[PDB]
Amino acid sequence: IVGGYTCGANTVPYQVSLNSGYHFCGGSLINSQWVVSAAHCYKSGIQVRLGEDNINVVEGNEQFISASKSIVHPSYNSNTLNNDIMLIKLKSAASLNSRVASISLPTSCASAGTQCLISGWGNTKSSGTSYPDVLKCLKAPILSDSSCKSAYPGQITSNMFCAGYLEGGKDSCQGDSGGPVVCSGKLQGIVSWGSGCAQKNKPGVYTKVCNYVSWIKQTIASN
Ligand SMILES: Cc1[nH]c2c(F)cc(Br)cc2c1CCN
Ligand SMILES: [Ca+2]
């Protein structure tokens, strides 16, 4: 996250770190057994880390649970990033509490101008590279479809939205991938892609979660 703030320990209790020897992506806990992330975060050997603040220090509220199965969306295209969503099932159910909690799925899509909270352990620099230890947060509005398409001609599908600031300076970044965009208490987005981080006229692009709720629910129901 570039231009954000330190969230505070366990204040984003649905935020997960995906670890394969090291943090490589975020995700969102959606019930005791399932995490939502980005399809471009797929790899094998994933351990889900819940209750994290400093990802380099065991502080006492973590739960470390290996993935038993990952399911990349059937229509994910890795060239265009269309349908950039994945589900990860945990080998055992997480223990839910104030600091480890699921985030509700949307019942309808969100509107331009809605305020959202984006969070992650990604790069905090727009030029250069610095990776934080503690969770970072950014409040950012959803941008109009027309602004989003103007920023990225020919690249924005019906499964994507932009959020952030056209002036630059505040954005998600590398390593925030797969993490949450939460708006009015619902998981509306997944950190997906962009051109650089926090660059003028290049806001972040996010998977439009509301288009996937039927698939998420029926996947969970049979897996
Ligand atoms: C999700 C993602 N991953 C990135 C990456 F690996 C390198 C760079 Br430069 C940008 C990004 C973004 C977009 C952030 N709005
Ligand atoms: Ca920790």
**Neighbour order of strands in the sheet with 5-6:** 5-6, 136-141, 115-120, 180-183, 186-193, 204-208, 160-163
Please tell me whether 62 is known to bind a ligand. Answer: yes
Ligand 1 centre and the CA of 209: distance in Å?
A: 19
* One domain, residues 63 and 135: no
Atom of ligand 1 nearest to the CA of 171: 15
Residue 141 sits in a domain whose CATH number is 2.40.10.10
Please tell me whether 48 is known to bind a ligand. Answer: no
Here the tokens at position 10 are 């366990």
* One domain, residues 2 and 111: yes
* One domain, residues 153 and 219: no
* One domain, residues 96 and 191: no
Ligand 1 centre and the CA of 205: distance in Å?
A: 9
Experimental method: X-ray
Here the tokens at position 175 are 């390593």
* Protein residue with its CA nearest to atom 1 in ligand 1: 193
Number of domains, the chain = 2
Query: CA 185, 188, 191, 193 torsion: positive or negative?
Result: negative
What single DSSP character describes residue 106?
Answer: P
What's the longest Cα–Cα distance across the chain?
A: 47
* One domain, residues 115 and 204: yes
* One domain, residues 3 and 66: no
> Measured in Å, how far apart are the chain's first and last C-alpha atoms?
33
| DSSP H helical ranges for the chain | 145-151, 213-222
Written as one letter, the residue type at 19 is N
* One domain, residues 108 and 206: yes
Written as one letter, the residue type at 107 is T
Written as one letter, the residue type at 197 is C
3-class DSSP state of 150: helix
Dist. CA 20–CA 219, nearest whole Å: 24
Q: Which domain holds residue 130?
A: 1-12+103-210
- DSSP E strands in the chain: the ranges are 5-6, 15-19, 23-31, 34-37, 47-50, 63-72, 86-90, 115-120, 136-141, 160-163, 180-183, 186-193, 204-208
Residue 53 annotated among the catalytic residues of the structure: no
Ligand 1: residues within 6 Å at CB? 171-174, 177, 191-194, 196-197, 204
Dist. CA 218–CA 197, nearest whole Å: 35
* One domain, residues 130 and 182: yes
* One domain, residues 55 and 146: no
List 70, 119, 177, 192, catalytic entry:
177
Residue 73 annotated among the catalytic residues of the structure: no
Ligand with the closest atom to the CA of 123: 1
Here the tokens at position 25 are 């992506």
Residue 40 annotated among the catalytic residues of the structure: yes
* One domain, residues 111 and 200: yes
Dist. CA 217–CA 100, nearest whole Å: 21
Dist. CA 159–CA 144, nearest whole Å: 14
Neighbouring-strand partners of residue 90:
67
Dist. CA 88–CA 114, nearest whole Å: 28
* One domain, residues 46 and 97: yes
What single DSSP character describes residue 33?
Answer: T
> Which residues lie closer than 8 Å to 71 by C-beta, 6 or more apart?
86, 87, 88, 89, 219, 223
List 23, 37, 40, 119, catalytic entry:
40
Q: From residue 145, how far is each of 19, 77, 156 by CA, in Å?
A: 34, 21, 9
Q: From residue 200, how far is each of 5, 62, 120, 145, 203 by CA, in Å?
A: 20, 37, 21, 17, 8
Measured in angstroms, the resolution is 1.4
Please tell me whether 177 is known to bind a ligand. Answer: yes
Dist. CA 14–CA 45, nearest whole Å: 21
* One domain, residues 132 and 76: no
Q: Nearest CA to 5 among 169, 182, 172, 135?
A: 135
Dist. CA 189–CA 174, nearest whole Å: 16
Neighbouring-strand partners of residue 6:
136
Dist. CA 214–CA 44, nearest whole Å: 25
User: Per residue, what are the HEC states of 171-222?
Assistant: ECCCCCCCCEEEECCEEEEEEEECCCCCECCECEEEEEHHHHHHHHHHHHHH
